[PDB]
Amino acid sequence: STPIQQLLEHFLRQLQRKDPHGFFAFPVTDAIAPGYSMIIKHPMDFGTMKDKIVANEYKSVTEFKADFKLMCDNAMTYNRPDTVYYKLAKKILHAGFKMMS
Numbered sequence: 001s002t003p004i005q006q007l008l009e010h011f012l013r014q015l016q017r018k019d020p021h022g023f024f025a026f027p028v029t030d031a032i033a034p035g036y037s038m039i040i041k042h043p044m045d046f047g048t049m050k051d052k053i054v055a056n057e058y059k060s061v062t063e064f065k066a067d068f069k070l071m072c073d074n075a076m077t078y079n080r081p082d083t084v085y086y087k088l089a090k091k092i093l094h095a096g097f098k099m100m101s
């Protein structure tokens with residue numbers, strides 16, 4: 001495990017604590033939300049981010065943060081402002097970036 005992998009594992013653990021229901025734990029399936037894959041062109045979630053860390057696909061912290069923002073942006077485009085998914089996405093986006101400093 002490289003230093004970057006160790007840091008991103010730490011960030012990911014702390015980010016996922018902000019999603020206790022696990023709305024962002026796995027990809028949003030079309031089974032869960034029919035037509036999701038036809039609207040959101042670049043899906044992302046914490047589970048995929050974990051796999052990318054393990055595969056050593058993040059070569060910088062910036063790349064990791066970009067995937068986190070993508071996940072949140074997707075939720076804020078697919079869902080209307082008055083939904084639990086939008087509200088949590090916005091909350092954790094700001095709180096997450098603050099945490100990572």
Ligand SMILES: COc1ccc(-c2cn(C)c(=O)c3cc(C(=O)NC4CCS(=O)(=O)CC4)sc23)cc1OC
Nearest residue numbers: 022023024025026028032033075078079080083085
């Ligand atoms: C059954 O477990 C889940 C239940 C819901 C979700 C989920 C997560 N995220 C991030 C979403 O953006 C999301 C959006 C969902 C949804 O049903 N959207 C519709 C209702 C809200 S809307 O009308 O604004 C857009 C259409 S379900 C869902 C994911 C799940 O597993 C990880």
